[PDB]
Coordinates of C-alpha atoms in Angstrom, one line a residue:
Chain D
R1 CA 77.5 75.2 61.0
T2 CA 80.8 75.9 62.9
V3 CA 80.6 75.7 66.7
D4 CA 82.8 77.2 69.4
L5 CA 83.0 74.9 72.5
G6 CA 84.5 77.5 74.9
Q7 CA 84.8 75.9 78.3
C8 CA 83.3 72.6 77.1
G9 CA 85.9 70.0 76.1
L10 CA 84.9 68.0 73.1
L11 CA 84.7 64.7 74.9
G12 CA 82.5 66.4 77.6
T13 CA 79.8 66.6 74.9
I14 CA 79.3 62.8 75.4
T15 CA 79.1 62.6 79.2
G16 CA 77.8 66.1 80.0
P17 CA 79.7 67.9 82.7
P18 CA 78.0 71.2 83.5
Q19 CA 80.2 73.2 81.2
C20 CA 78.9 71.1 78.3
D21 CA 75.2 71.3 79.1
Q22 CA 74.5 73.4 75.9
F23 CA 76.3 71.0 73.6
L24 CA 74.9 67.5 74.5
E25 CA 73.4 67.2 70.9
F26 CA 75.4 69.7 69.0
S27 CA 75.5 69.9 65.2
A28 CA 78.5 71.3 63.5
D29 CA 80.8 70.8 60.4
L30 CA 83.7 72.5 62.1
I31 CA 84.3 72.3 65.8
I32 CA 86.4 75.0 67.5
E33 CA 88.1 73.8 70.8
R34 CA 89.6 76.1 73.4
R35 CA 92.5 75.9 75.9
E36 CA 90.0 76.4 78.7
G37 CA 87.9 73.4 77.6
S38 CA 87.6 70.5 80.0
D39 CA 86.1 67.1 79.3
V40 CA 85.5 66.5 83.0
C41 CA 84.2 67.9 86.2
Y42 CA 85.2 65.1 88.6
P43 CA 89.0 64.4 88.1
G44 CA 89.7 61.8 85.6
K45 CA 90.4 61.2 81.9
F46 CA 88.9 59.5 78.8
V47 CA 90.6 56.2 77.7
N48 CA 91.8 56.6 74.1
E49 CA 91.0 60.3 74.3
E50 CA 93.0 61.2 71.2
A51 CA 91.2 58.6 69.0
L52 CA 87.8 59.6 70.3
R53 CA 88.4 63.3 69.7
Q54 CA 89.4 62.4 66.1
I55 CA 86.1 60.6 65.6
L56 CA 84.1 63.4 67.1
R57 CA 85.9 66.2 65.2
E58 CA 84.7 64.8 61.9
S59 CA 81.4 63.5 63.2
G60 CA 79.2 66.5 62.2
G61 CA 77.9 66.4 65.8
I62 CA 75.9 63.9 67.9
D63 CA 72.3 62.9 68.6
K64 CA 71.5 61.2 71.9
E65 CA 69.2 58.2 72.4
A66 CA 68.0 56.4 75.5
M67 CA 69.6 53.2 76.5
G68 CA 66.7 52.2 78.8
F69 CA 68.6 50.9 81.9
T70 CA 66.4 50.8 85.0
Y71 CA 67.5 50.0 88.5
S72 CA 66.1 48.8 91.9
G73 CA 67.8 48.1 95.2
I74 CA 70.4 50.9 94.8
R75 CA 70.7 54.7 94.6
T76 CA 71.2 56.1 91.1
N77 CA 71.9 59.7 92.2
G78 CA 75.5 59.9 93.3
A79 CA 76.7 63.5 93.1
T80 CA 79.8 65.5 93.9
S81 CA 80.8 69.1 94.8
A82 CA 83.1 68.9 91.8
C83 CA 80.2 69.1 89.3
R84 CA 78.3 72.2 90.1
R85 CA 74.8 72.4 88.7
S86 CA 72.7 74.3 91.4
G87 CA 74.8 72.6 94.1
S88 CA 76.4 69.1 93.9
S89 CA 75.5 67.3 90.7
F90 CA 77.0 64.8 88.2
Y91 CA 77.5 64.1 84.5
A92 CA 74.2 64.7 82.7
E93 CA 74.4 61.6 80.6
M94 CA 75.7 59.2 83.3
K95 CA 74.3 57.7 86.5
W96 CA 76.5 57.3 89.5
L97 CA 75.2 54.0 91.0
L98 CA 75.6 53.5 94.7
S99 CA 74.3 50.9 97.2
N100 CA 71.0 51.7 98.8
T101 CA 72.7 52.6 102.1
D102 CA 76.2 53.4 103.3
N103 CA 78.6 50.4 103.5
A104 CA 75.7 48.1 102.4
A105 CA 76.5 45.4 99.8
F106 CA 76.1 46.5 96.2
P107 CA 74.1 43.9 94.3
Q108 CA 75.7 42.0 91.4
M109 CA 73.9 43.5 88.4
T110 CA 73.7 43.0 84.6
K111 CA 72.3 45.5 82.1
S112 CA 72.2 45.1 78.3
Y113 CA 71.3 47.4 75.4
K114 CA 70.8 46.5 71.8
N115 CA 71.6 48.9 68.9
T116 CA 68.4 48.9 66.9
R117 CA 69.5 51.7 64.6
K118 CA 71.4 51.5 61.3
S119 CA 74.5 53.4 62.5
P120 CA 77.0 52.4 65.1
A121 CA 76.2 53.6 68.7
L122 CA 78.9 55.3 70.8
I123 CA 78.6 53.9 74.3
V124 CA 80.5 55.4 77.3
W125 CA 80.9 54.2 80.9
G126 CA 83.0 55.3 83.9
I127 CA 85.1 53.3 86.4
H128 CA 85.4 54.9 89.8
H129 CA 88.8 54.6 91.5
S130 CA 88.0 55.8 95.1
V131 CA 90.5 57.8 97.0
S132 CA 90.5 55.3 99.8
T133 CA 89.2 51.7 100.5
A134 CA 86.9 53.1 103.2
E135 CA 85.3 55.3 100.5
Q136 CA 84.9 52.4 98.2
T137 CA 83.4 50.3 101.0
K138 CA 81.2 53.2 102.0
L139 CA 79.9 53.7 98.5
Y140 CA 79.5 50.1 97.2
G141 CA 80.2 47.7 100.1
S142 CA 83.4 46.0 101.0
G143 CA 85.1 43.3 99.0
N144 CA 86.4 42.9 95.5
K145 CA 84.9 45.1 92.8
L146 CA 84.7 44.1 89.1
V147 CA 83.1 45.6 86.0
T148 CA 82.9 43.5 82.8
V149 CA 81.8 44.8 79.4
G150 CA 80.8 42.4 76.6
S151 CA 79.6 42.6 73.0
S152 CA 79.7 40.3 70.0
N153 CA 82.9 38.2 70.4
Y154 CA 84.3 40.7 72.9
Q155 CA 84.8 40.7 76.7
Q156 CA 86.9 43.1 78.8
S157 CA 87.0 43.6 82.6
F158 CA 88.1 46.6 84.8
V159 CA 89.1 46.3 88.4
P160 CA 89.0 49.5 90.4
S161 CA 92.2 50.7 92.0
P162 CA 91.2 52.5 95.2
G163 CA 94.0 54.8 96.2
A164 CA 94.8 58.4 97.0
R165 CA 96.3 60.5 94.2
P166 CA 96.8 64.3 94.2
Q167 CA 93.6 66.2 94.9
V168 CA 91.6 68.1 92.3
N169 CA 90.6 70.2 93.9
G170 CA 90.0 68.3 97.2
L171 CA 89.0 64.9 95.9
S172 CA 91.7 62.2 95.6
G173 CA 89.6 59.7 93.7
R174 CA 89.2 59.5 89.9
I175 CA 86.4 58.6 87.4
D176 CA 87.9 57.5 84.1
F177 CA 85.7 57.0 81.0
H178 CA 85.8 54.0 78.7
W179 CA 83.9 53.7 75.4
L180 CA 83.0 51.3 72.7
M181 CA 81.2 51.5 69.3
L182 CA 78.3 49.2 69.1
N183 CA 77.5 47.8 65.6
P184 CA 73.9 47.9 64.4
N185 CA 72.0 44.9 65.9
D186 CA 74.8 44.1 68.4
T187 CA 74.2 44.1 72.1
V188 CA 76.4 45.6 74.8
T189 CA 76.3 43.9 78.3
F190 CA 77.6 45.4 81.5
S191 CA 78.2 43.2 84.6
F192 CA 79.2 45.0 87.8
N193 CA 78.9 45.0 91.6
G194 CA 80.0 48.6 92.1
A195 CA 82.5 51.4 91.1
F196 CA 80.5 51.6 87.8
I197 CA 79.2 54.9 86.3
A198 CA 76.5 54.0 84.0
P199 CA 75.4 55.5 80.7
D200 CA 71.9 56.8 80.5
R201 CA 72.1 57.6 76.8
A202 CA 74.1 56.5 73.7
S203 CA 75.4 58.9 71.0
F204 CA 75.0 58.6 67.3
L205 CA 77.2 60.5 64.8
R206 CA 75.2 63.0 62.8
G207 CA 77.5 63.0 59.7
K208 CA 78.6 66.1 57.9
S209 CA 76.7 68.1 55.2
Chain K
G1 CA 103.6 61.4 75.9
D2 CA 103.9 58.0 74.2
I3 CA 103.5 54.9 76.3
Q4 CA 106.7 52.8 76.3
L5 CA 106.5 49.0 76.8
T6 CA 109.5 47.1 78.1
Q7 CA 109.3 43.4 77.5
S8 CA 111.5 40.8 79.3
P9 CA 113.3 38.7 78.7
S10 CA 114.4 39.6 75.2
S11 CA 115.5 36.0 74.4
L12 CA 114.5 32.8 76.2
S13 CA 115.6 29.1 76.0
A14 CA 112.9 26.6 76.9
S15 CA 111.8 23.0 76.5
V16 CA 108.4 21.3 75.7
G17 CA 106.4 21.1 78.8
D18 CA 107.9 24.2 80.4
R19 CA 105.9 27.1 81.9
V20 CA 107.2 30.2 80.1
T21 CA 106.6 33.7 81.6
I22 CA 106.9 36.9 79.6
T23 CA 106.5 40.2 81.2
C24 CA 105.5 43.6 79.8
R25 CA 105.8 46.8 81.9
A26 CA 104.1 50.0 80.7
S27 CA 105.5 53.5 81.4
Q28 CA 102.1 54.6 82.7
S29 CA 99.0 52.9 84.0
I30 CA 96.8 51.5 81.2
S31 CA 94.1 49.5 83.1
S32 CA 93.5 46.3 81.1
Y33 CA 94.4 47.7 77.6
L34 CA 97.1 45.3 76.6
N35 CA 97.3 42.7 73.8
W36 CA 99.8 39.8 73.1
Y37 CA 100.8 38.5 69.6
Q38 CA 102.8 35.6 68.4
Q39 CA 104.9 35.8 65.2
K40 CA 106.9 33.2 63.3
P41 CA 109.5 34.0 60.6
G42 CA 107.9 34.9 57.3
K43 CA 104.4 35.3 58.7
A44 CA 102.2 38.1 60.0
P45 CA 101.7 38.3 63.7
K46 CA 98.8 36.4 65.2
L47 CA 96.6 37.7 68.1
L48 CA 96.6 35.6 71.3
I49 CA 95.3 37.8 74.1
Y50 CA 93.4 41.1 74.0
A51 CA 92.2 43.2 77.0
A52 CA 95.1 41.8 79.1
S53 CA 93.4 38.5 79.9
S54 CA 90.8 37.7 77.2
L55 CA 91.7 34.6 75.1
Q56 CA 91.1 35.2 71.4
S57 CA 88.7 32.6 69.9
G58 CA 90.5 29.6 68.6
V59 CA 93.7 30.2 70.7
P60 CA 94.8 27.4 73.0
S61 CA 94.0 27.7 76.7
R62 CA 97.6 27.3 77.7
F63 CA 98.1 31.0 76.8
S64 CA 97.1 33.1 79.8
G65 CA 97.3 36.9 80.1
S66 CA 97.3 38.7 83.5
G67 CA 97.9 42.1 85.0
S68 CA 96.2 45.5 85.2
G69 CA 97.8 48.9 85.4
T70 CA 101.5 48.8 84.6
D71 CA 102.7 45.2 85.0
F72 CA 101.5 42.5 82.6
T73 CA 102.4 38.9 82.1
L74 CA 101.9 36.4 79.3
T75 CA 102.1 32.8 80.7
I76 CA 102.4 29.8 78.4
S77 CA 101.8 26.7 80.4
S78 CA 102.9 23.4 79.1
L79 CA 105.0 24.8 76.2
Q80 CA 104.3 23.0 72.9
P81 CA 106.6 22.7 69.8
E82 CA 104.4 25.1 67.8
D83 CA 105.0 27.7 70.5
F84 CA 108.6 28.5 69.6
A85 CA 108.3 31.9 68.1
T86 CA 108.6 35.6 69.0
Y87 CA 106.0 37.3 71.2
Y88 CA 104.9 41.0 71.4
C89 CA 102.9 43.0 73.8
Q90 CA 101.0 46.1 72.5
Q91 CA 99.0 48.7 74.4
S92 CA 95.6 49.7 73.2
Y93 CA 95.2 52.6 75.7
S94 CA 96.5 55.6 73.8
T95 CA 97.7 57.0 70.5
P96 CA 100.2 56.1 69.0
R97 CA 99.8 52.4 69.5
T98 CA 103.2 51.0 70.8
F99 CA 104.7 47.6 71.1
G100 CA 107.2 45.9 73.3
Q101 CA 110.5 45.0 71.7
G102 CA 109.7 41.3 71.5
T103 CA 110.6 38.1 73.2
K104 CA 112.1 35.2 71.2
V105 CA 111.4 31.8 72.7
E106 CA 113.9 29.3 71.3
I107 CA 114.4 25.5 71.8
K108 CA 116.9 24.5 74.5
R109 CA 119.4 21.8 73.6
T110 CA 122.9 20.6 74.6
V111 CA 126.0 22.6 73.6
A112 CA 127.2 21.7 70.1
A113 CA 130.5 23.0 68.8
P114 CA 130.6 24.5 65.3
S115 CA 132.3 22.8 62.4
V116 CA 134.4 25.6 60.8
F117 CA 135.0 25.9 57.1
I118 CA 136.7 28.6 55.1
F119 CA 136.4 29.4 51.4
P120 CA 138.8 31.7 49.5
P121 CA 137.5 34.0 46.8
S122 CA 136.8 32.3 43.5
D123 CA 138.8 33.1 40.4
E124 CA 135.7 34.4 38.6
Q125 CA 134.9 36.9 41.4
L126 CA 138.6 38.2 41.5
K127 CA 138.4 39.0 37.8
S128 CA 135.6 41.5 38.7
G129 CA 138.0 43.3 41.1
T130 CA 136.5 42.3 44.5
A131 CA 137.3 39.5 47.0
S132 CA 134.9 37.8 49.3
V133 CA 136.3 35.4 51.9
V134 CA 133.6 33.2 53.6
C135 CA 133.9 31.5 57.0
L136 CA 131.1 29.0 57.8
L137 CA 130.2 27.9 61.3
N138 CA 127.9 24.9 60.9
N139 CA 125.4 23.3 63.3
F140 CA 126.3 24.8 66.6
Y141 CA 124.4 25.7 69.8
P142 CA 123.9 28.1 71.6
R143 CA 123.6 30.9 69.0
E144 CA 126.2 33.2 70.6
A145 CA 129.5 32.9 68.8
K146 CA 132.4 35.3 68.0
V147 CA 134.1 35.3 64.6
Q148 CA 137.2 37.4 64.1
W149 CA 139.1 37.9 60.9
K150 CA 142.9 38.0 60.6
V151 CA 144.9 38.8 57.5
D152 CA 148.7 38.5 57.9
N153 CA 147.9 38.1 61.6
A154 CA 146.4 41.5 61.9
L155 CA 142.9 41.8 63.3
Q156 CA 140.1 43.2 61.1
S157 CA 137.2 45.5 61.8
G158 CA 134.2 46.9 59.9
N159 CA 134.8 45.0 56.6
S160 CA 132.9 41.8 57.3
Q161 CA 129.2 40.9 57.6
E162 CA 127.5 38.0 59.4
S163 CA 124.3 36.1 58.7
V164 CA 122.7 33.5 60.9
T165 CA 120.0 30.9 60.1
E166 CA 116.9 30.4 62.1
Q167 CA 117.1 27.5 64.5
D168 CA 117.0 24.1 62.7
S169 CA 113.8 22.1 63.2
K170 CA 115.6 18.8 63.0
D171 CA 118.5 19.3 65.4
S172 CA 117.9 22.8 67.0
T173 CA 121.3 24.1 66.0
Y174 CA 122.3 27.4 64.3
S175 CA 124.7 28.1 61.4
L176 CA 126.5 31.3 60.7
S177 CA 128.3 32.8 57.8
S178 CA 130.9 35.5 58.1
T179 CA 132.0 37.3 54.9
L180 CA 135.0 39.5 54.7
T181 CA 134.8 41.9 51.7
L182 CA 137.8 43.8 50.3
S183 CA 138.7 45.4 47.1
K184 CA 140.9 43.0 45.0
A185 CA 143.7 45.5 45.3
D186 CA 143.5 45.6 49.1
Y187 CA 143.2 41.8 49.0
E188 CA 146.4 41.3 47.0
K189 CA 148.5 43.2 49.5
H190 CA 148.3 40.3 52.1
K191 CA 149.0 36.6 52.1
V192 CA 147.3 34.7 55.0
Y193 CA 143.6 34.9 55.7
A194 CA 142.3 33.4 58.9
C195 CA 138.9 33.0 60.6
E196 CA 139.1 32.6 64.4
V197 CA 136.0 31.2 66.1
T198 CA 135.1 31.5 69.8
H199 CA 132.3 29.3 71.1
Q200 CA 131.1 27.8 74.4
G201 CA 131.5 24.4 72.9
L202 CA 135.2 24.9 72.1
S203 CA 137.8 24.7 75.0
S204 CA 139.9 27.4 73.2
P205 CA 139.3 29.3 69.9
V206 CA 139.6 27.4 66.6
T207 CA 141.3 28.9 63.5
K208 CA 140.8 28.1 59.8
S209 CA 143.0 29.8 57.3
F210 CA 144.7 29.6 53.8
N211 CA 147.5 31.4 52.1
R212 CA 146.7 33.5 49.1
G213 CA 148.5 31.2 48.2
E214 CA 147.0 27.6 48.1
Chain F
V1 CA 87.4 37.8 57.0
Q2 CA 90.4 37.6 54.6
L3 CA 92.6 40.6 54.0
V4 CA 94.6 40.4 50.7
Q5 CA 97.2 43.1 50.0
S6 CA 98.8 44.3 46.8
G7 CA 102.2 43.0 45.7
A8 CA 105.8 44.0 46.5
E9 CA 107.0 47.5 45.5
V10 CA 110.4 49.0 44.7
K11 CA 110.7 52.7 45.0
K12 CA 113.4 55.4 44.8
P13 CA 114.1 57.7 47.7
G14 CA 111.7 60.7 47.7
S15 CA 108.9 59.0 45.8
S16 CA 105.7 57.6 47.2
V17 CA 103.9 54.2 47.4
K18 CA 100.2 53.2 47.9
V19 CA 99.4 49.8 49.3
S20 CA 96.0 48.2 48.9
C21 CA 94.2 45.9 51.4
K22 CA 91.1 44.1 50.1
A23 CA 88.7 42.6 52.6
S24 CA 86.6 39.6 51.6
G25 CA 83.9 38.1 53.8
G26 CA 81.2 40.3 55.2
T27 CA 80.6 43.9 56.3
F28 CA 83.6 46.1 55.6
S29 CA 81.7 48.7 57.5
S30 CA 81.6 46.7 60.8
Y31 CA 85.3 47.3 61.8
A32 CA 88.3 49.6 61.4
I33 CA 91.5 48.9 59.4
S34 CA 95.0 49.6 60.8
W35 CA 98.4 49.6 59.2
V36 CA 101.5 48.2 61.0
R37 CA 104.9 47.8 59.5
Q38 CA 108.0 45.8 60.3
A39 CA 111.5 46.6 59.1
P40 CA 113.8 43.6 58.3
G41 CA 114.8 42.0 61.6
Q42 CA 113.0 44.7 63.6
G43 CA 109.9 45.0 65.8
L44 CA 106.5 46.3 64.9
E45 CA 105.5 49.9 64.3
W46 CA 102.0 51.3 64.1
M47 CA 101.3 53.9 61.4
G48 CA 97.6 54.7 61.7
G49 CA 94.1 53.5 61.1
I50 CA 90.8 54.3 59.4
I51 CA 87.1 53.7 60.2
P52 CA 85.6 53.2 56.7
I53 CA 82.0 53.7 57.8
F54 CA 83.0 57.2 59.1
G55 CA 85.8 58.0 56.7
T56 CA 87.9 59.2 59.6
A57 CA 91.6 58.4 60.1
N58 CA 94.1 58.5 63.0
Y59 CA 97.8 58.8 62.4
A60 CA 101.1 58.4 64.3
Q61 CA 102.6 61.9 64.7
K62 CA 106.1 60.5 64.0
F63 CA 105.1 60.2 60.3
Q64 CA 104.6 64.0 60.1
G65 CA 101.7 64.0 57.6
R66 CA 103.6 61.7 55.2
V67 CA 100.9 59.0 55.5
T68 CA 97.3 59.0 54.1
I69 CA 94.9 56.2 54.8
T70 CA 91.7 55.9 52.8
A71 CA 89.0 53.4 52.2
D72 CA 86.4 52.6 49.5
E73 CA 83.3 50.9 50.9
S74 CA 82.1 49.9 47.4
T75 CA 85.2 47.7 46.9
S76 CA 85.8 46.8 50.6
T77 CA 89.4 48.1 50.1
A78 CA 91.6 50.2 52.3
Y79 CA 94.8 52.0 51.2
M80 CA 97.9 53.3 52.8
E81 CA 99.9 55.9 50.8
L82 CA 103.4 56.8 52.1
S83 CA 105.2 59.8 50.6
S84 CA 108.7 61.2 50.5
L85 CA 110.1 57.7 51.0
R86 CA 113.4 57.2 52.7
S87 CA 115.6 54.2 53.2
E88 CA 114.3 53.6 56.7
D89 CA 110.8 53.1 55.2
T90 CA 112.0 49.7 53.7
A91 CA 109.7 47.3 55.5
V92 CA 106.9 44.8 55.3
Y93 CA 103.6 46.8 55.6
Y94 CA 100.6 45.0 57.0
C95 CA 96.9 45.9 57.2
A96 CA 94.9 44.5 60.1
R97 CA 91.3 44.4 61.2
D98 CA 90.5 46.3 64.5
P99 CA 87.0 45.3 65.7
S100 CA 87.1 48.0 68.4
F101 CA 87.0 51.1 66.2
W102 CA 90.0 52.5 68.1
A103 CA 88.3 52.1 71.5
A104 CA 90.7 49.3 72.4
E105 CA 92.6 48.9 69.1
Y106 CA 93.6 45.3 68.6
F107 CA 94.7 43.4 65.4
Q108 CA 92.4 40.5 65.1
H109 CA 93.0 39.5 61.5
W110 CA 96.1 40.4 59.4
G111 CA 96.9 40.7 55.7
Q112 CA 99.8 38.8 54.3
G113 CA 102.0 41.9 54.2
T114 CA 103.5 44.0 51.4
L115 CA 107.3 44.4 51.1
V116 CA 108.3 48.0 50.1
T117 CA 111.9 48.5 49.3
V118 CA 113.1 52.1 49.1
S119 CA 116.5 52.5 47.5
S120 CA 118.4 54.4 44.8
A121 CA 119.7 51.0 43.5
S122 CA 118.4 49.6 40.2
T123 CA 117.1 46.2 39.5
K124 CA 120.0 43.8 39.1
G125 CA 120.3 40.0 38.9
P126 CA 123.0 38.4 41.1
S127 CA 126.4 37.2 40.2
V128 CA 126.8 33.6 41.4
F129 CA 130.2 32.4 42.5
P130 CA 131.2 28.9 43.7
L131 CA 132.2 28.3 47.3
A132 CA 134.4 25.4 46.1
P133 CA 135.1 22.5 48.4
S134 CA 138.7 22.0 49.4
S135 CA 140.9 20.5 52.1
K136 CA 140.0 23.6 54.1
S137 CA 136.3 22.8 53.9
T138 CA 136.2 19.2 55.2
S139 CA 135.6 17.7 58.6
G140 CA 135.5 14.0 59.3
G141 CA 134.2 12.4 56.1
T142 CA 132.1 15.5 55.3
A143 CA 132.8 18.5 53.0
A144 CA 131.1 21.8 52.8
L145 CA 130.5 23.6 49.5
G146 CA 128.2 26.4 48.4
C147 CA 127.2 29.4 46.2
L148 CA 127.9 33.0 46.9
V149 CA 124.9 35.0 45.5
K150 CA 126.2 38.5 45.2
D151 CA 125.1 42.0 44.3
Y152 CA 121.4 41.6 43.4
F153 CA 118.5 44.1 43.9
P154 CA 115.9 43.9 45.2
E155 CA 114.9 41.1 47.6
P156 CA 114.1 38.2 47.2
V157 CA 116.1 35.3 45.6
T158 CA 115.5 31.6 45.8
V159 CA 118.2 28.9 45.9
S160 CA 117.9 25.2 45.4
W161 CA 120.5 22.5 44.8
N162 CA 120.3 19.9 42.1
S163 CA 116.9 21.2 41.0
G164 CA 115.4 20.5 44.4
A165 CA 116.8 16.9 44.6
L166 CA 119.3 17.9 47.4
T167 CA 117.8 19.4 50.6
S168 CA 119.5 17.5 53.3
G169 CA 122.2 19.6 55.0
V170 CA 121.5 22.8 53.0
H171 CA 121.7 26.2 54.7
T172 CA 120.6 29.2 52.7
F173 CA 121.5 32.3 54.8
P174 CA 119.4 35.4 55.1
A175 CA 120.6 38.1 52.8
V176 CA 122.7 41.1 53.9
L177 CA 122.4 44.6 52.5
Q178 CA 125.9 45.8 51.6
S179 CA 127.1 49.4 51.4
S180 CA 126.5 49.4 47.6
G181 CA 122.8 49.1 48.1
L182 CA 122.9 45.6 46.6
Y183 CA 122.1 42.4 48.5
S184 CA 124.3 39.3 49.0
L185 CA 123.8 35.8 50.5
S186 CA 125.4 32.4 50.5
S187 CA 123.8 29.0 50.4
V188 CA 125.9 26.0 51.6
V189 CA 125.5 22.3 51.9
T190 CA 127.5 19.6 53.6
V191 CA 127.9 16.3 51.7
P192 CA 130.2 13.2 52.0
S193 CA 133.7 14.1 51.0
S194 CA 133.9 10.9 48.9
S195 CA 131.2 12.2 46.6
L196 CA 132.9 15.4 45.3
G197 CA 134.4 13.7 42.3
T198 CA 131.3 11.7 41.3
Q199 CA 128.2 13.7 42.2
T200 CA 127.4 16.9 40.3
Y201 CA 126.4 19.7 42.7
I202 CA 124.6 22.6 41.0
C203 CA 123.0 25.5 42.8
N204 CA 119.9 27.0 41.1
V205 CA 119.4 30.7 41.8
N206 CA 116.2 32.5 40.9
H207 CA 115.8 36.2 41.1
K208 CA 112.2 36.8 39.9
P209 CA 112.5 40.6 40.1
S210 CA 115.1 40.5 37.3
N211 CA 113.9 37.4 35.5
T212 CA 117.4 35.8 36.0
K213 CA 117.9 32.1 36.4
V214 CA 121.4 30.9 37.0
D215 CA 122.7 27.3 37.4
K216 CA 126.3 27.2 38.7
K217 CA 128.1 23.9 39.0
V218 CA 130.4 23.7 42.1
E219 CA 133.5 21.6 41.9
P220 CA 136.7 21.3 43.9
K221 CA 139.8 22.7 42.4

């Protein structure tokens, strides 16, 4: 009933970098976190990381449920040397959406998910800040990129900032993770034409004993 | 560590119909995680913009938020009379939540010199062993003014306190009281009490005074 | 959603205070509650928040475990308790609704605020002294007069003139906190010089915290 995360950072339990593969649905009243824990495999950070850690520390653990997004006209299998899982891989709970072919236009898409449970749903997504505009063009097509998240009486947009920051280890881009808590019976909507890392599953707090 | 927000300007003079621009610069990049509030004296703040550019329901469309990363702007097009107030940015990106220091938007008007009045301590206060001398600057604009106290021609420091009214809704002026407080013993050791007022609307400083005296 | 807070408090240094925030409307469990304070004349300062449906709270480190935020879902009421009070804790404390559960914390609806005064001073009604009109308080055909409302604790006081009949040209100044720990303010009015001998001018001072009502007549000498 008390769990030692080791190399897995607590927020990694939500998105699933390879160091967190054995914790994607953990159950624990006390969570032990370690200096060697990392939330990420590709360089980046969680928005409101401190607040979200607070929520998860007293959550009693997490149970994952499918969000049911399906796709066509794009690749859903973006991967990176940074996340090693028998070669290049990605976050286990997320899908790195790419245009069907290099430099091809990414289609404007909209995906929605309704929380049909009685508890609030924790929903994460990533925004990819490519290391270069050529990379962004290569991955999603050229032109302006925009991601919009909406829920009941709420809308917020994110515009990728393609630039080259210090490498980690060799990659100058960043994937930052954003989240929201979806009330029972509310619907989250994502509108995006690229630079969007999509959730495959939502997380529900288990509650303590 | 914490995210610091620097708002500018701190104080702004404007007229109905103006386009007012308030900037907020964050000490690290915070994507679109920035909110704007309005606050008037005696009232809780009110949300205008969340997520850098989303209009809160019920808020007038002349309020527009823009920016992403570190530089943010609140634009009020077509300034209205109910918009004279103080405005705050707040970042929603990290813990602790932090605010800008605030921007006061006040009503522009023509310069108006203060009328200056002085009031010696009352008999009933002196019986209690204290002396308060009050200098009043009435209905002036702009708000900036300098009040200096002189007793027997010597300048004073540290023993006075000022208070200023909010801008008047009918004529857009300010008033200001300056109160010099001395023990009645210290009071009685001098004869002439003078208030010297420096203001843009006065060609040279005005002085009001009395002797201890009559 | 209405947020209604408990009434003003006066506390001695070192004690503690607990402020209540009662939410009417629907679904206390559908949002978070934050607490933000504002010292007199100052900016805004965030203290922390709570998610009632989870029972989890988030605090500003600067408060060094002096703050405890709690919530009772059965009464749709949140609380902020602040301990080891110091003078710098004197402020208006607000609760606010955060629909984002800390994901993008924003204050969509606010309570009316609760003044908390922290001081070693004791409750005291003001002394009311005349600011008598004189040849030194006239300009043109106009004279200034007033009332000096001194040495009261705590805030606030109310001042009217001639029982509310006289409002034109009145200026009641914000109070100043003096070194004694007691408050002082002046209220002034300009009137026609010619009226000083024929119109009675009385300032009505009300200090509800001490149940003191004072009516001082102001005359030239």
